[PDB]
Write a protein that holds these residues in place. Sequence first.
Motif, PDB file in Angstrom:
ATOM      1  N   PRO A   1      18.247  -7.391   7.156  1.00  0.00           N
ATOM      2  CA  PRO A   1      17.449  -7.324   8.387  1.00  0.00           C
ATOM      3  C   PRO A   1      15.954  -7.579   8.216  1.00  0.00           C
ATOM      4  O   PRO A   1      15.246  -7.646   9.221  1.00  0.00           O
ATOM      5  CB  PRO A   1      17.695  -5.889   8.878  1.00  0.00           C
ATOM      6  CG  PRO A   1      17.920  -5.118   7.630  1.00  0.00           C
ATOM      7  CD  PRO A   1      18.682  -6.043   6.719  1.00  0.00           C
ATOM      8  N   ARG A   2      15.467  -7.678   6.956  1.00  0.00           N
ATOM      9  CA  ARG A   2      14.062  -7.965   6.650  1.00  0.00           C
ATOM     10  C   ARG A   2      14.027  -9.069   5.586  1.00  0.00           C
ATOM     11  O   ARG A   2      14.882  -9.122   4.695  1.00  0.00           O
ATOM     12  CB  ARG A   2      13.343  -6.724   6.081  1.00  0.00           C
ATOM     13  CG  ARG A   2      13.451  -5.466   6.931  1.00  0.00           C
ATOM     14  CD  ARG A   2      12.677  -5.564   8.221  1.00  0.00           C
ATOM     15  NE  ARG A   2      11.230  -5.544   8.000  1.00  0.00           N
ATOM     16  CZ  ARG A   2      10.329  -5.929   8.901  1.00  0.00           C
ATOM     17  NH1 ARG A   2      10.715  -6.357  10.098  1.00  0.00           N
ATOM     18  NH2 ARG A   2       9.031  -5.877   8.615  1.00  0.00           N
TER      19      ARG A   2
ATOM     20  N   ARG B   1       9.362 -11.053   0.178  1.00  0.00           N
ATOM     21  CA  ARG B   1       7.941 -11.373   0.222  1.00  0.00           C
ATOM     22  C   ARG B   1       7.702 -12.883   0.066  1.00  0.00           C
ATOM     23  O   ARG B   1       6.739 -13.407   0.642  1.00  0.00           O
ATOM     24  CB  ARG B   1       7.151 -10.574  -0.811  1.00  0.00           C
ATOM     25  CG  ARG B   1       7.438  -9.056  -0.725  1.00  0.00           C
ATOM     26  CD  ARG B   1       7.125  -8.447   0.646  1.00  0.00           C
ATOM     27  NE  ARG B   1       7.545  -7.048   0.673  1.00  0.00           N
ATOM     28  CZ  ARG B   1       8.776  -6.632   0.978  1.00  0.00           C
ATOM     29  NH1 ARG B   1       9.689  -7.494   1.414  1.00  0.00           N
ATOM     30  NH2 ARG B   1       9.085  -5.347   0.898  1.00  0.00           N
TER      31      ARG B   1
ATOM     32  N   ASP C   1      13.786  -0.417  -0.708  1.00  0.00           N
ATOM     33  CA  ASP C   1      13.053  -1.672  -0.440  1.00  0.00           C
ATOM     34  C   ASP C   1      12.934  -1.963   1.053  1.00  0.00           C
ATOM     35  O   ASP C   1      12.964  -3.120   1.478  1.00  0.00           O
ATOM     36  CB  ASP C   1      13.687  -2.850  -1.196  1.00  0.00           C
TER      37      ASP C   1
ATOM     38  N   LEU D   1      15.038  -1.627   3.376  1.00  0.00           N
ATOM     39  CA  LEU D   1      16.226  -2.236   3.990  1.00  0.00           C
ATOM     40  C   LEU D   1      16.923  -1.315   4.976  1.00  0.00           C
ATOM     41  O   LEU D   1      17.465  -1.777   5.980  1.00  0.00           O
ATOM     42  CB  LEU D   1      17.207  -2.746   2.935  1.00  0.00           C
ATOM     43  CG  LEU D   1      16.672  -3.898   2.078  1.00  0.00           C
ATOM     44  CD1 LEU D   1      17.623  -4.214   0.956  1.00  0.00           C
ATOM     45  CD2 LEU D   1      16.383  -5.150   2.931  1.00  0.00           C
TER      46      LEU D   1
ATOM     47  N   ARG E   1       3.333  -6.596  -3.751  1.00  0.00           N
ATOM     48  CA  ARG E   1       3.855  -6.960  -2.428  1.00  0.00           C
ATOM     49  C   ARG E   1       5.077  -6.209  -1.946  1.00  0.00           C
ATOM     50  O   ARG E   1       5.271  -6.133  -0.724  1.00  0.00           O
ATOM     51  CB  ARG E   1       4.111  -8.478  -2.346  1.00  0.00           C
ATOM     52  CG  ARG E   1       2.828  -9.257  -2.674  1.00  0.00           C
ATOM     53  CD  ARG E   1       3.028 -10.756  -2.549  1.00  0.00           C
ATOM     54  NE  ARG E   1       4.238 -11.225  -3.237  1.00  0.00           N
ATOM     55  CZ  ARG E   1       4.733 -12.449  -3.105  1.00  0.00           C
ATOM     56  NH1 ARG E   1       4.096 -13.354  -2.369  1.00  0.00           N
ATOM     57  NH2 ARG E   1       5.854 -12.792  -3.735  1.00  0.00           N
ATOM     58  N   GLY E   2       5.890  -5.679  -2.853  1.00  0.00           N
ATOM     59  CA  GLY E   2       7.105  -4.956  -2.463  1.00  0.00           C
ATOM     60  C   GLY E   2       6.805  -3.763  -1.570  1.00  0.00           C
ATOM     61  O   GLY E   2       7.138  -3.764  -0.381  1.00  0.00           O
ATOM     62  N   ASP E   3       6.072  -2.792  -2.112  1.00  0.00           N
ATOM     63  CA  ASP E   3       5.695  -1.613  -1.342  1.00  0.00           C
ATOM     64  C   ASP E   3       4.717  -2.010  -0.251  1.00  0.00           C
ATOM     65  O   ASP E   3       4.810  -1.509   0.873  1.00  0.00           O
ATOM     66  CB  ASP E   3       5.038  -0.561  -2.262  1.00  0.00           C
ATOM     67  CG  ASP E   3       6.018   0.319  -2.999  1.00  0.00           C
ATOM     68  OD1 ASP E   3       6.773   1.050  -2.329  1.00  0.00           O
ATOM     69  OD2 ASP E   3       5.998   0.308  -4.254  1.00  0.00           O
TER      70      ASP E   3
ATOM     71  N   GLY F   1       4.472  -4.639   1.610  1.00  0.00           N
ATOM     72  CA  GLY F   1       5.201  -5.224   2.738  1.00  0.00           C
ATOM     73  C   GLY F   1       6.102  -4.280   3.514  1.00  0.00           C
ATOM     74  O   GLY F   1       6.761  -4.688   4.478  1.00  0.00           O
ATOM     75  N   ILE F   2       6.164  -3.027   3.080  1.00  0.00           N
ATOM     76  CA  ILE F   2       6.873  -1.955   3.792  1.00  0.00           C
ATOM     77  C   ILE F   2       5.815  -1.030   4.421  1.00  0.00           C
ATOM     78  O   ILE F   2       5.992  -0.574   5.559  1.00  0.00           O
ATOM     79  CB  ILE F   2       7.788  -1.168   2.828  1.00  0.00           C
ATOM     80  CG1 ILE F   2       8.781  -2.104   2.116  1.00  0.00           C
ATOM     81  CG2 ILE F   2       8.531  -0.044   3.576  1.00  0.00           C
ATOM     82  CD1 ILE F   2       9.418  -1.428   0.864  1.00  0.00           C
TER      83      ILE F   2
ATOM     84  N   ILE G   1       2.673  -1.918   5.255  1.00  0.00           N
ATOM     85  CA  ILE G   1       2.033  -2.667   6.342  1.00  0.00           C
ATOM     86  C   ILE G   1       3.075  -3.696   6.888  1.00  0.00           C
ATOM     87  O   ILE G   1       4.056  -4.006   6.196  1.00  0.00           O
ATOM     88  CB  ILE G   1       0.671  -3.328   5.932  1.00  0.00           C
ATOM     89  CG1 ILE G   1       0.882  -4.612   5.086  1.00  0.00           C
ATOM     90  CG2 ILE G   1      -0.268  -2.338   5.250  1.00  0.00           C
ATOM     91  CD1 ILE G   1      -0.375  -5.395   4.764  1.00  0.00           C
TER      92      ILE G   1
ATOM     93  N   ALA H   1       5.365  -6.740   7.467  1.00  0.00           N
ATOM     94  CA  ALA H   1       5.666  -7.806   6.503  1.00  0.00           C
ATOM     95  C   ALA H   1       4.937  -9.115   6.813  1.00  0.00           C
ATOM     96  O   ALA H   1       4.488  -9.800   5.888  1.00  0.00           O
ATOM     97  CB  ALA H   1       7.165  -8.038   6.437  1.00  0.00           C
TER      98      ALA H   1
END
Lengths: 519, 519, 519
Positions: free
Chosen positions: B326-327, B330, C166, C168, C282-284, C286-287, C289, C291
């Motif tokens: 659903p997402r 990066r 992540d 999800l 970018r992993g954290d 993009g969650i 803030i 994406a």
Amino acid sequence: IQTQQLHAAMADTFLEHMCRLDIDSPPITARNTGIICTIGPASRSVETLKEMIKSGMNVARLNFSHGTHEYHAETIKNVRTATESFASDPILYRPVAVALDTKGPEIRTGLIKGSGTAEVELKKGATLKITLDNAYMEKCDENILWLDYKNICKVVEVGSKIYVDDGLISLQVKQKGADFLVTEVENGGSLGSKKGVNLPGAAVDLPAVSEKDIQDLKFGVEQDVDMVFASFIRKASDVHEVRKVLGEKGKNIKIISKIENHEGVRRFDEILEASDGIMVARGDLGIEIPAEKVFLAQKMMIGRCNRAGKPVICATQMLESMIKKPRPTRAEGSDVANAVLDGADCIMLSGETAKGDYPLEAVRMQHLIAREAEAAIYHLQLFEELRRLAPITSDPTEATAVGAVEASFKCCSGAIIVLTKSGRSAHQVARYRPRAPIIAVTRNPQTARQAHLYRGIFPVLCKDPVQEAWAEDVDLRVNFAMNVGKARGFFKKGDVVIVLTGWRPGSGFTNTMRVVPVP
Amino acid sequence: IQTQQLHAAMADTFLEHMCRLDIDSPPITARNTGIICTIGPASRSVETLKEMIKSGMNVARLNFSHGTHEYHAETIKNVRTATESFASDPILYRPVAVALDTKGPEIRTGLIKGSGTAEVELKKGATLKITLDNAYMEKCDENILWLDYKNICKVVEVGSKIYVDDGLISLQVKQKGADFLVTEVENGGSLGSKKGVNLPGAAVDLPAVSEKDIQDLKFGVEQDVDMVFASFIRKASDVHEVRKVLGEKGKNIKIISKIENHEGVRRFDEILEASDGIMVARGDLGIEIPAEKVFLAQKMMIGRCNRAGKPVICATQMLESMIKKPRPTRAEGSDVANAVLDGADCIMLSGETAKGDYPLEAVRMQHLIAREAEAAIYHLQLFEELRRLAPITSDPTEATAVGAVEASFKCCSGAIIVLTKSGRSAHQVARYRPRAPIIAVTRNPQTARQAHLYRGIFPVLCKDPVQEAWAEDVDLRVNFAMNVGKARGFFKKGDVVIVLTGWRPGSGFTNTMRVVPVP
Amino acid sequence: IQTQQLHAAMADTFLEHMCRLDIDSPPITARNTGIICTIGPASRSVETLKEMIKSGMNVARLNFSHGTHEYHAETIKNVRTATESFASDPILYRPVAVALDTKGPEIRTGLIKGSGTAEVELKKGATLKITLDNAYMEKCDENILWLDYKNICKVVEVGSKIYVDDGLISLQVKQKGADFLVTEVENGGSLGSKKGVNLPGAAVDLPAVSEKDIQDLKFGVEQDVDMVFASFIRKASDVHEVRKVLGEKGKNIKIISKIENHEGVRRFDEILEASDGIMVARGDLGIEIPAEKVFLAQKMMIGRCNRAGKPVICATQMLESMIKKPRPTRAEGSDVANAVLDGADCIMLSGETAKGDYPLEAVRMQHLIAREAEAAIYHLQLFEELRRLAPITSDPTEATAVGAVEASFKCCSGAIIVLTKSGRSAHQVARYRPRAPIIAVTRNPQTARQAHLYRGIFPVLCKDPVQEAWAEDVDLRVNFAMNVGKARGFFKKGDVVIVLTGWRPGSGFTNTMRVVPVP
Ligand SMILES: Cn1c2cc([S@@](C)=O)ccc2c2cnn(Cc3cccc(N)c3)c(=O)c21
Ligand SMILES: Cn1c2cc([S@@](C)=O)ccc2c2cnn(Cc3cccc(N)c3)c(=O)c21
Ligand SMILES: O=C([O-])C(=O)[O-]
Ligand SMILES: O=C([O-])C(=O)[O-]
Ligand SMILES: O=C([O-])C(=O)[O-]
Ligand SMILES: [Mg+2]
Ligand SMILES: [Mg+2]
Ligand SMILES: [Mg+2]
Ligand code: NA
Ligand code: NA
Ligand code: NA
């Protein structure tokens, strides 16, 4: 691309732009930079003034450092007779403005031996006493010099330099008395009567607006002058004093501040804010500050005026040798061209037109040089910079003006036609420095005369009756501009021109830009 | 200056522009980049298509590599039912285009063991014979693979690489027969039925337009499609063949050439000249050329299309992980943003909308990312460069368009409203990449659908009767655009907008630009 | 001009630069961007680590979010065995750095049903209670989820979103208790054990440096690591706390702050000032803030790090699909290229090398893409901007560095050879982003490992005895670099290279730049 330096115009670097300047690339017929001519004995007859207008004169400057009100009223009458002798053909009629240049806080010497032609020889090393005793105001000689600045001893010291007659004669104060000075001649020469005196580095306390300047400004209002060139402006309060003297009756007269001393340069920003425009008055400026620094002050002032969108005039000794010769020196040709490349809205002639032997040739030379230099401007970078140093605003008139200038570059238009009542909509276009001439159509005679202060504005005075339907009156004025452009060789049938108009009658409604073929 | 990255927009260097990008600076409501969605089992019901339009879908893509004409006619019927379900409110109605994507010269494998779900395991190092014997077209297994390209042995040699299923399975030719190949599995995996095969470095001689492509293009004309995405275009004559097949009846259908092989990249300039637009078809392209070089081909093509003023689409695997999640990853968020910063007019979804578990989320994500990226474009340098690489012409419509874009930047307009019949006047504005959304008002439904190919065009379909006086009909259409902008949150009463109109009815007369407040 | 995108390099506009990018223009052999690989079960054997170094790995990252000190000490031992297996040939030896990545203030869930492989299905719409009762820390299921953040109820409210694994799985707080929450599943899926939890918009009050992080940082000092990647840095005092923990013994270890929450982005300038470098985690991020905004934060941080001359790393999901597939998606290829074009000094692999099926292919792909992208940088404008945003200083080392970079562009040098003790003189050159590779010769092993943080630095560890005469020792080290460049295919005999050396032994004396032919 062969004409109007269009090959150099396409260069993507300033260095390549210079490399591409072509002496065989003809400029367009239109000459954008206004020419201001000082009127005097060589140019004040009606017959000569008609030839001056035909040669390119746009503004007649009256120098109030000399002459009586009766003398200046007769000059203004002759300027108007000559200007109106062309009024029967509105398509070709060129409006001519009248500018009053104040005497301001000048220092002058007395008469040599009682005569106006008598001269004395000042030799280097010789002693020369400066007196304030009125008994010697008409008895100046090689031993004693009278001057009219009564407080001179309070502002100079031993070692102070005193310059006389366009800074050609130099003296150094060796002894100071309570009301006299004893000087040594450093640079000698022949001293005449009533010469200008400069005291560089001295805090001269003469008023910015004297009792004489008040009479002269009030006379200007009575005579319906278009603008005042205010001498020796040093600060914003000096401009406010001129504005107060002109008052309500003179509220529409433009005030051009003359910058001619160090204080005027230092306080330039506040002077510019309060003024309608600026004159880089290089004669006095180049005596008040070191002559080698004048180009810096000139480029700084033209730069700041272009950035502010206010008119700037470059003045004094531009074609000086043409007072006695029919052709200028190479430095004079270069000076006029570089003043236009710098961004001067107007260029001026002083002695060249006032008392010289070749006034018409001097006007014609400024016309020829200015037109060549206008084609050599690097519009690619200039327009890019003017756009970036321009604020984002909700003013629809400014967005229309910049849109029109951008469109004029895209189609290399023959002109930008602008309908204007107060002149503002045309000034807004001129501030972006288009290559195309701006034909400003107005029914206001003062607006037509004052338009000459801005680079590229060709004011045309519509004399037709007003049509009852607004759309038909707009069309009539646009057709009048199409006729002017065709008659003056700016464009021809089928060429593309930019047309700026408003949505309703009155000032401040310019919002429509049209790209139309010439009928 | 806090909104729409306007602080970064004012930086005078690209490095300072990057330093000023602010995650807390909100973008405007308008999203300029068109979103193209591939329709399939996850998205072909009327109910889902209504949600797809609400989520941001502008173009529905029909992939003719699969499905019958009956299947595609039903999809087109459902797209039209969903699109017209919103027609009762013209102010909010969003036109939706239909695009036909050709199968083109593909190579496909046969069926594994006669079933569509059956799969075989290809192990690295194992031998695999490629046959052309139709007796095995439904009997593919780990030992023998049938494919439909009958001339494959003439174009490959020993050492040639063969890729299968999105280049995931790799084989190397070890032995070559007259009508069979013996290969070794390099990259193994699970092999399914009817998978795509690529032969990088081989001169595949399949026709650009096959007998099937002819039937499909003719079906597109009968179904009134807006555009064709032509697969594997290698040269200008391939585009001319598609144009000939569409013929007179399909003369207004736009041809977008898909660049997906080395020859298409090498002969790009001639393909672009002959096409209405380009698709950077990255899936096949990234198998035909080294995957590490695809970004170079993408940036080159988007650059050349922006320079030519022709639409360019970025396609394939933009949000690939959203087929099951659903997402997005990066890298996927970055890919969509960088395609918009590069200059792509449109972005596309393939499996994400055709067969995935989250089609609506994928459409919404492209909408969100594209809008953020649009605010982050460095318009200061982009506009300067587009203007310089634009020829000086006597076309008044182009001068009006660039004048309008310049004016939109000066007043940070809420929109540029353009009245258009064929779409050309709106395309002329979009080519200069304004920050402001372009509201294109038209009464032509096909023009409204095709407008989605250009960045920033928001087509609106005027349904009002024509007013007898031209000026009143122009005013009605401009008022309709003011209502659309207010309803959609682009601007509000008192804001300033740019309005482009013509002087008479018909195409090619756009010459008037007005800066007006929103009523 | 056919190689290294030199035709695009000569374009005088960014748009023409894009138009000239050529897929057939080969890059140089040197690959400038450092590659950081996370070590795990797929890559921790000595045999695999040797292949990882050969494939392009420059830095081995140890993720302290998992594993014991015994496990990490064994990984470090294997990295060193593999790295030193190449030491017998100093000309080809590639230094390899060891980076410790802290767990930091993470939130993790408990074990599902007591097993590590067990998973539960969370359905959209279902209720899910979050508990802090340790009785359920190993009894998580579809009805109850334990997590280790004891203060969670104090920082969230009704309506708060909670993301798991992540981001999800998404939950929304519906009811809040004193020490439990009742949530509704928004985005469902399969929930495993010990998954990461993010609370966007919540002011999580966990310490930046926990008791575990202190033990791990102290372990890093004992193990002689080269750098620390500090997780969830929010402010300058967090960096100062890490610096204090490393202390005097760890004073030379570089601190790279990981930016992965909104506060880290907001207080970026103070974090950058206090840190040795930055990681765009970018992993954290993009969650924490939206994406769609991550690309803005990435470009802002890379821009500000390039402006400050501090290393910046782009991390997470760059080639994510390669965990299960031998080739990346088109979005992944684009992501790696755009991170290099943005200005990232290093790029990173996480699961792709730690647990994936194709670690070597993932390393090779980052190498291939980074090298292609390095040739596509528009150095003409980048260098011009870096020079302008660089202060005029009396530092002779900075003037020598910029002089060397300017000279490298003028002669398209094969390399800039720099002799360095601490690494500073080589970092000074890298800050100007030359196209030429920088061969940094040092006798300090830590300097050689840490050099990989800067774009373009190829550190080489000189093992020769010191020559007694300084000039002969300088010549020996320069000859060693000439041998390295020839052996690695950077240049050949007769090519021109730039050589930077000092006037006396020790740090801070680099002042000599020589342009010399390769012997
Ligand atoms: C005089 N001048 C300009 C004039 C203009 S318009 C006012 O004509 C626009 C840019 C410029 C520019 C830009 N750079 N330089 C410096 C320079 C660059 C290359 C060659 C030379 N001789 C000078 C100028 O002197 C210069
Ligand atoms: C990506 N990009 C641009 C994008 C635009 S509009 C298409 O967004 C305009 C100019 C430019 C430019 C100019 N110079 N450089 C080089 C450069 C300069 C300074 C910093 C960086 N990171 C790159 C660009 O990459 C670059
Ligand atoms: O007054 C002036 O014009 C001067 O001094 O040049
Ligand atoms: O055909 C396509 O779109 C592709 O290959 O990406
Ligand atoms: O910690 C990281 O690297 C992340 O969150 O991407
Ligand atoms: Mg004066
Ligand atoms: Mg394809
Ligand atoms: Mg993290
Ligand atoms: Na233009
Ligand atoms: Na503008
Ligand atoms: Na150079």
